[PDB]
Amino acid sequence: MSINSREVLAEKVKNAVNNQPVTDMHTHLFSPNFGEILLWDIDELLTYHYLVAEVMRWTDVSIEAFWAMSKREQADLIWEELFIKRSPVSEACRGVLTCLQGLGLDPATRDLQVYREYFAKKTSEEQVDTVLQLANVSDVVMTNDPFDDNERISWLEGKQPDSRFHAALRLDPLLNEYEQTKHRLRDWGYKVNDEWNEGSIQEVKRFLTDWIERMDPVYMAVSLPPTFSFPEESNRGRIIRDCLLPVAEKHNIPFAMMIGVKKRVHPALGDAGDFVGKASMDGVEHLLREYPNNKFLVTMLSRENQHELVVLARKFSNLMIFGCWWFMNNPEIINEMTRMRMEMLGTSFIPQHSDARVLEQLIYKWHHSKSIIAEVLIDKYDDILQAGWEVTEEEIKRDVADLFSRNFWRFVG
Amino acid sequence: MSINSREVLAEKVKNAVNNQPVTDMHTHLFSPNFGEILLWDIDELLTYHYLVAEVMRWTDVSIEAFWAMSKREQADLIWEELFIKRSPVSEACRGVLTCLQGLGLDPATRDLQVYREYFAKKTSEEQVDTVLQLANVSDVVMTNDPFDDNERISWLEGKQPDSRFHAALRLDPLLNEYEQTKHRLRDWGYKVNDEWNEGSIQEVKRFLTDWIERMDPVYMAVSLPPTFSFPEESNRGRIIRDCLLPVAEKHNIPFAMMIGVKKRVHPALGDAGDFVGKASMDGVEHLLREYPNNKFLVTMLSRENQHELVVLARKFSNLMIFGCWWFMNNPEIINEMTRMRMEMLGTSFIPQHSDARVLEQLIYKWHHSKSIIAEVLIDKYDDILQAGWEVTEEEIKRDVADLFSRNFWRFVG
Amino acid sequence: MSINSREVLAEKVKNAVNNQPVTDMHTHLFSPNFGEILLWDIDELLTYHYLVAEVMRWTDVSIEAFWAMSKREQADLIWEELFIKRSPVSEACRGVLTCLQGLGLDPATRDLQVYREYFAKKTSEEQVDTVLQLANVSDVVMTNDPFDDNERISWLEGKQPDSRFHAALRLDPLLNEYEQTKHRLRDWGYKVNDEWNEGSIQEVKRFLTDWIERMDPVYMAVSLPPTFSFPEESNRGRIIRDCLLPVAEKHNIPFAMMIGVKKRVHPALGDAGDFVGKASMDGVEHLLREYPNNKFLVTMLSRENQHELVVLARKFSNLMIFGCWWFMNNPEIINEMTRMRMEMLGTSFIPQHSDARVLEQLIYKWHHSKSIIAEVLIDKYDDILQAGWEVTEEEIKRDVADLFSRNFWRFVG
Ligand SMILES: [Zn+2]
Ligand SMILES: [Zn+2]
Ligand SMILES: [Zn+2]
Ligand SMILES: [Zn+2]
């Protein structure tokens, strides 16, 4: 038959959404065999940079003093300032609670000591199994930076990630800081010249090719400022034009662009010091139109870029938009973004990614987003149901699978 | 009786909204006596450019191959790709279903062949009577382009539109492509000079005057790019200043501006290749302030222009804003736009227009929009009812008539 | 006794919100002992500039004729045009009704004459007691302009405001119209030179210092245009850099910036002729980063500046954002703004201010805003209750006190 009641439909959508294994196509997590770079712990959750920014709006403790404290002390301060002295109603604070509850811990007691004991008696491998199970995440895409001495080592040592973890080649240093990076390249055997000649071009391409072969990335990525433009006679513009795009096309690897971040407007805050700005769509429009054989994954930081980004996706099939990034990762914005996207793109987009920096975040990141996405799906199905259309649970499971996993794998080939 | 609760209010409002005859002040429909230019058919509905854009995001069929197929083949592909392989949850797909259901056809069967048979046994005149009846549309405003050889002929042959259809003089070729258009003008007896002198000015005005007399348009219209500015030393700026405005004032005809469309960012897609951009409000502000004796109808394409456009309407009574155009014609946006408009303008605006290109679209266009507009009205009436205001059903019927028909006719005199 | 259900939660929050005494940190009201500048009356409510703009969209009465009528005649016209000829559904009209109902008058009768009689038999001091009581407002922050001959007099006469009223030093003439203002300064004994030298700098600082000592303002304020930038080699840029900031720091007085207003786009409308524009965040960002020892209160006029303003607050603890100003003071916007703010800032912001120009407006301004703020809180508390957190009624009361009063006083010291 078909679904005949609004209740069955809802039960059906929520169940399908909750049961669908998720492919988180963009995170800052690492296969557990990569070592300490994989962050997890209630102390890591509480010291997430989102919460550092928030605690600094309340506490009288200087930023210097904060950075001087131990992670445990920072966590204690954040807990006291954001959870005890004021209700933890922000999205980031709410998330910490969702993680605790999901792990079987009880937020009702506010017993941070007891919460810590839970983690003290587990290994990274165990927690990963636990979390991926609780968050129903089957595949995690990492952010792998070959310019980070730490991460760099494991890749050179031939270490391969857990089969549940996939690599993504981060190129920010190369594209945004070529002047300083070119020195490290030549130091690694990549003889780039001071002038952008065929020699420099071939060496940069070799660097990319070497790492593509080494990581077997699902895509190459870069985060860009509000002022991003293309074409552009700059190191970034030339590298993208002469090296990145050609290589990406040859290996049929998508180019992921996270646009709109204004770095370090408040240096002292570190990762919590980045701001946002609306970008022009001209550069993305040009890339999509002039490079029809290249695939692009895009997410933008400014609320004001979201609707036009959806419209751009209507224009180019070689564009796949994804997630509600950072400052967009808040219920009010996730909801409006997801509705605009489905209304203009049907199911041809990737609703969300976690951008998790701490393992446990996969729990709240996906739990918070799934309930909103389910609500949107229920309304959209109810609307065509009202129009006389019949939908089957199989069709819903199909649609949900496309949104949470298939659209991505299908796009990166 | 007494409307003394949100519940009674909801019933009375929905009834009033549903029963109110609609004047669709902007469409791409034509009086049936104008011939084949009047599109209608389930195949026409499925090949609407909104769906072409959407199918191209999914199908592997090349755009060239798509355009090579017959309309029936295109419709079959779109149906399979957007309705069968994925649930038809997008607004445009949902609309097709609403039309079918409204005509008495059953979407539950997904029998495209049976749907086609319905249309095969009807004439244009009959379908028009059927659709206008089902969509409860009493008056349709057309988009009449004197630069289109096809349409041009019927007007020259003295053919007059059905009394339910009204004309609107489209001037895009003249204002946006004067360099190429000036040649057609002189070829039609309008001796415009290479230089913008009094001779050219008088000839352009004569062209406008001749067509105003020929069509008896309710308003003159033009769609403009995000970069639109005024004053401006350009063909567009000079024609508007020296010809359009003076003539519009003399005949007391409103000037309609549809701002924000960036034409052909993806040429191969044809009508489905247009993009959007936020525009500056400076030009509109200047026109409203410096030409107090001219009337302006405005709608904008960018989500980011909507709130400030509402504020501009608060500033100038010679400005009438209307509808949720194109990329704004989606539930999430229609809702936010309609609420911002009513909150700052009360009932002094035109909530919607269909922009229908295919006859049957009047059904879903108005059905989808009316349910949203009705909900906004219920909230607003309830808020004053709870404040102690007594709203009568007659007052609701009056307000609803203003929003859906009278405000337009009152503005265009 | 834990909060067992959302329904019970809804009640505790609404009670706390309704019972919490409000500090309205930005209004255009005056202590009753300041004289006629304190506007109150149903006629004043109806002739509020928000309604002037709205009536002009409907009435055929010329703007000249309108200004020529007496306040009573204007009120009669506005009442007839916006309440009788069309339902009073706009936010501003709804507000008038809420005020009447709150005062015990009955909107159901639409008896404007009877409403007027209520006010005719009361004094300013009495109405102030009545209104502050009904709106549950314990503290009102005024807008005091030393450049207004009228207001200026009472301050020079040593008149001190009622203890419920606080002063805020308005500096628009000085910062935005220095060229014309410098003449008044020297005329008052402040010997500023034509050139911006140390002499001019010291004299401007003396002017500020003299008025700070005279008003004992909670903060110094200025409203700025969409084009506002800083640093800037202009009178405004230099005065802010060399005089305002240093003085503000020395006295630890916050600098309030209301950004985005485009003055007089429609001169004839007077106060109702101001428009809006999106501003760059660069100037505010620079001020916050380069002047860590200065405190800034910011509110912006453009809908499109709201989200990034929230993000900027996440970056700088010396920034306190407040209210939904003017064109933002509409339910649809207040809701989205308040949700974005709480999601990214928890309770570290000031949700609203009335900007009341007419005494009675405190009633609707706060009643309309409180219901929305209460709904947002109910949702946010429900989300953490759902995550296992045990919110207590006393904690809700504390959070509510912070949002409506304590955050402000805590920020201004
Ligand atoms: Zn919204
Ligand atoms: Zn990331
Ligand atoms: Zn159109
Ligand atoms: Zn104000």
Short mmCIF file of N, CA and C in Angstrom, two decimals, chain A residues 30-100:
data_model
loop_
_atom_site.label_atom_id
_atom_site.label_comp_id
_atom_site.label_asym_id
_atom_site.label_seq_id
_atom_site.Cartn_x
_atom_site.Cartn_y
_atom_site.Cartn_z
N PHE A 30 39.81 11.96 13.38
CA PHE A 30 40.85 11.13 12.79
C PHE A 30 40.68 9.67 13.20
N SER A 31 41.08 8.76 12.31
CA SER A 31 41.02 7.34 12.62
C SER A 31 41.78 7.21 13.94
N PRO A 32 41.26 6.40 14.88
CA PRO A 32 41.93 6.24 16.18
C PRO A 32 43.39 5.81 16.14
N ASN A 33 43.80 5.13 15.07
CA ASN A 33 45.19 4.68 14.96
C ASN A 33 46.14 5.83 14.61
N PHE A 34 45.58 7.02 14.40
CA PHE A 34 46.40 8.18 14.09
C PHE A 34 46.94 8.85 15.35
N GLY A 35 46.52 8.35 16.51
CA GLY A 35 47.01 8.90 17.76
C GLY A 35 46.21 9.96 18.48
N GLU A 36 46.93 10.78 19.24
CA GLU A 36 46.35 11.85 20.05
C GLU A 36 45.59 12.94 19.29
N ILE A 37 45.81 13.05 17.98
CA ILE A 37 45.11 14.09 17.23
C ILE A 37 43.60 13.85 17.25
N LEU A 38 43.19 12.64 17.60
CA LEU A 38 41.77 12.33 17.70
C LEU A 38 41.32 12.78 19.08
N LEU A 39 40.57 13.87 19.14
CA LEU A 39 40.11 14.39 20.42
C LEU A 39 38.78 13.79 20.83
N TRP A 40 38.67 13.45 22.11
CA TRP A 40 37.44 12.90 22.69
C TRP A 40 37.60 13.08 24.18
N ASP A 41 36.49 13.22 24.91
CA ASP A 41 36.55 13.44 26.36
C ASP A 41 35.52 14.53 26.68
N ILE A 42 34.99 14.53 27.90
CA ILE A 42 34.04 15.56 28.28
C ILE A 42 34.82 16.87 28.43
N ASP A 43 36.10 16.77 28.79
CA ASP A 43 36.92 17.97 28.92
C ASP A 43 37.18 18.58 27.54
N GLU A 44 37.33 17.72 26.53
CA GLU A 44 37.56 18.19 25.16
C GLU A 44 36.27 18.83 24.65
N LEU A 45 35.13 18.23 25.00
CA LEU A 45 33.83 18.77 24.58
C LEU A 45 33.64 20.17 25.15
N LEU A 46 33.91 20.32 26.45
CA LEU A 46 33.75 21.61 27.11
C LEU A 46 34.75 22.67 26.67
N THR A 47 35.92 22.27 26.18
CA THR A 47 36.91 23.24 25.74
C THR A 47 36.91 23.47 24.22
N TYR A 48 35.88 22.95 23.55
CA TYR A 48 35.67 23.13 22.11
C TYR A 48 35.75 24.65 21.93
N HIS A 49 36.32 25.13 20.83
CA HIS A 49 36.45 26.57 20.66
C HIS A 49 35.14 27.34 20.64
N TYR A 50 34.04 26.68 20.28
CA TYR A 50 32.74 27.35 20.27
C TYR A 50 32.45 27.82 21.71
N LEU A 51 32.78 26.98 22.68
CA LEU A 51 32.52 27.31 24.08
C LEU A 51 33.53 28.29 24.67
N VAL A 52 34.74 28.32 24.11
CA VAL A 52 35.74 29.27 24.57
C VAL A 52 35.21 30.67 24.26
N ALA A 53 34.73 30.87 23.04
CA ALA A 53 34.18 32.15 22.63
C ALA A 53 33.06 32.56 23.59
N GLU A 54 32.16 31.63 23.86
CA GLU A 54 31.03 31.90 24.74
C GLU A 54 31.40 32.19 26.20
N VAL A 55 32.36 31.44 26.75
CA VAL A 55 32.72 31.67 28.14
C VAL A 55 33.40 33.03 28.29
N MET A 56 34.17 33.43 27.28
CA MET A 56 34.84 34.72 27.34
C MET A 56 33.87 35.91 27.35
N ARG A 57 32.61 35.69 26.97
CA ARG A 57 31.63 36.78 27.00
C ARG A 57 31.13 36.99 28.42
N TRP A 58 31.32 35.99 29.27
CA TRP A 58 30.87 36.05 30.66
C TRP A 58 31.94 36.21 31.73
N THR A 59 32.96 35.36 31.67
CA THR A 59 34.02 35.34 32.68
C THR A 59 34.90 36.58 32.77
N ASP A 60 35.42 36.82 33.97
CA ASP A 60 36.31 37.94 34.21
C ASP A 60 37.75 37.48 34.08
N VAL A 61 37.94 36.17 33.95
CA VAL A 61 39.26 35.59 33.78
C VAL A 61 39.81 36.08 32.45
N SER A 62 41.04 36.59 32.45
CA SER A 62 41.65 37.09 31.23
C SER A 62 41.88 35.94 30.24
N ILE A 63 41.95 36.27 28.96
CA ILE A 63 42.16 35.25 27.94
C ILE A 63 43.54 34.61 28.15
N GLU A 64 44.50 35.41 28.62
CA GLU A 64 45.85 34.91 28.88
C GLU A 64 45.78 33.87 29.99
N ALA A 65 45.11 34.22 31.09
CA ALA A 65 44.96 33.31 32.21
C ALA A 65 44.24 32.04 31.78
N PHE A 66 43.25 32.18 30.90
CA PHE A 66 42.50 31.03 30.43
C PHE A 66 43.42 30.04 29.72
N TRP A 67 44.22 30.54 28.78
CA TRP A 67 45.14 29.70 28.03
C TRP A 67 46.22 29.09 28.93
N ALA A 68 46.49 29.73 30.06
CA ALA A 68 47.50 29.24 31.00
C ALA A 68 46.98 28.07 31.83
N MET A 69 45.66 28.00 32.01
CA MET A 69 45.07 26.91 32.79
C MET A 69 45.19 25.58 32.07
N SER A 70 45.04 24.49 32.81
CA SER A 70 45.09 23.16 32.23
C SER A 70 43.73 22.91 31.60
N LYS A 71 43.65 21.92 30.71
CA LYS A 71 42.38 21.64 30.05
C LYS A 71 41.27 21.36 31.07
N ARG A 72 41.62 20.68 32.15
CA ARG A 72 40.64 20.36 33.18
C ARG A 72 40.13 21.63 33.85
N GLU A 73 41.04 22.56 34.12
CA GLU A 73 40.68 23.82 34.76
C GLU A 73 39.81 24.66 33.82
N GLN A 74 40.13 24.64 32.53
CA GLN A 74 39.36 25.39 31.54
C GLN A 74 37.95 24.82 31.51
N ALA A 75 37.85 23.49 31.49
CA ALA A 75 36.57 22.81 31.47
C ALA A 75 35.75 23.16 32.71
N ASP A 76 36.41 23.21 33.86
CA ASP A 76 35.71 23.55 35.10
C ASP A 76 35.14 24.95 35.03
N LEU A 77 35.92 25.88 34.49
CA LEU A 77 35.50 27.27 34.37
C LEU A 77 34.30 27.38 33.42
N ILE A 78 34.43 26.78 32.24
CA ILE A 78 33.37 26.81 31.25
C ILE A 78 32.07 26.20 31.80
N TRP A 79 32.20 25.08 32.50
CA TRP A 79 31.04 24.42 33.09
C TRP A 79 30.33 25.33 34.08
N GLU A 80 31.13 25.96 34.94
CA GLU A 80 30.60 26.86 35.96
C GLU A 80 29.96 28.11 35.35
N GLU A 81 30.68 28.74 34.41
CA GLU A 81 30.21 29.96 33.76
C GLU A 81 29.03 29.80 32.80
N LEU A 82 29.04 28.74 31.99
CA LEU A 82 27.99 28.54 31.00
C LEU A 82 26.86 27.57 31.35
N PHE A 83 27.07 26.71 32.34
CA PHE A 83 26.05 25.74 32.72
C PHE A 83 25.44 25.98 34.10
N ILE A 84 26.26 26.44 35.04
CA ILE A 84 25.79 26.68 36.40
C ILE A 84 25.32 28.11 36.68
N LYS A 85 26.14 29.10 36.32
CA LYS A 85 25.78 30.50 36.55
C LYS A 85 24.68 31.02 35.62
N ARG A 86 24.49 30.35 34.49
CA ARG A 86 23.44 30.70 33.51
C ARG A 86 23.01 29.37 32.89
N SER A 87 21.74 29.23 32.56
CA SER A 87 21.27 28.00 31.94
C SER A 87 21.99 27.79 30.62
N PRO A 88 22.41 26.55 30.35
CA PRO A 88 23.13 26.18 29.12
C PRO A 88 22.21 26.09 27.91
N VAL A 89 21.55 27.20 27.57
CA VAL A 89 20.61 27.21 26.45
C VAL A 89 21.17 27.40 25.05
N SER A 90 22.43 27.82 24.92
CA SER A 90 23.01 28.00 23.58
C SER A 90 23.10 26.64 22.89
N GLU A 91 23.21 26.65 21.57
CA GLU A 91 23.29 25.42 20.80
C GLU A 91 24.52 24.59 21.20
N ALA A 92 25.67 25.24 21.34
CA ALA A 92 26.89 24.52 21.70
C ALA A 92 26.82 23.88 23.09
N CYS A 93 26.24 24.60 24.06
CA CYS A 93 26.11 24.06 25.41
C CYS A 93 25.10 22.93 25.42
N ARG A 94 23.97 23.15 24.75
CA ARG A 94 22.92 22.14 24.63
C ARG A 94 23.55 20.85 24.07
N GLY A 95 24.44 21.02 23.09
CA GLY A 95 25.12 19.89 22.48
C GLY A 95 25.91 19.04 23.46
N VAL A 96 26.60 19.69 24.39
CA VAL A 96 27.38 18.96 25.37
C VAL A 96 26.44 18.05 26.16
N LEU A 97 25.30 18.58 26.56
CA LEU A 97 24.32 17.81 27.31
C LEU A 97 23.78 16.63 26.51
N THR A 98 23.49 16.86 25.23
CA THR A 98 22.99 15.79 24.38
C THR A 98 24.02 14.64 24.31
N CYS A 99 25.30 14.99 24.25
CA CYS A 99 26.36 13.97 24.19
C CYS A 99 26.37 13.15 25.48
N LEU A 100 26.37 13.83 26.61
CA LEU A 100 26.37 13.16 27.91
C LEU A 100 25.19 12.20 28.01
#
